[PDB]
Amino acid sequence: MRGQIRGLEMASKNSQDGISLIQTAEGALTETHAILQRVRELVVQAGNTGT
Amino acid sequence: MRGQIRGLEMASKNSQDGISLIQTAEGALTETHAILQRVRELVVQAGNTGT
């Protein structure tokens, strides 16, 4: 019992920390995304400016 | 969504600037036109002056 219980608590802890990891990753991807949006803007403008 | 939206705004911007271009062009053509009218006048006069 106490084995499964203690390791369970550590498993939920582990889980919340895994969450935090992927939140960091996805925040980096939020700014990645922001830049790519900006690139798209610059390509639209680029397409008009091509002539 | 935000992709299409931002690029849309830039597309309307692009459009107004294309308008401004063709307005410049057509203003040059307005003065072009003015001169050609003047030439026509000079040809009419030329036709009388031919004799």
Across A30-47, b (16+ Cβ under 10 Å) vs e yields: eeeeeeeeeebbeebbee
**Distance, CA of B44 to CA of B51 (rounded, Å):** 12
Q: Yes or no: say if B13 and A46 are a contact pair by the CB < 8 Å rule.
A: no
Q: Yes or no: say if B17 and A48 are a contact pair by the CB < 8 Å rule.
A: yes
Tokens of B20: 């401004």
Resolution, expressed in angstroms to one decimal: 5.5
CB contact under 8 A, A44 and B14: yes
Tokens of A45: 């403008």
Output the CA torsion A36→A39→A40→A42 (10° steps).
Answer: 170
CB contact under 8 A, B18 and A45: no
Method of elucidation:
cryo-EM
Contacts of B17 in chain A (CB under 8 A): 48
C-alpha dist (Å) from residue A16 to A9, A12, B50: 11, 6, 100
CB contact under 8 A, B17 and A44: no
The answer to whether residue B44 neighbours chain A at the CB level (below 8 Å) is: no
Q: Which residue of B has its CA nearest to A36?
A: B3
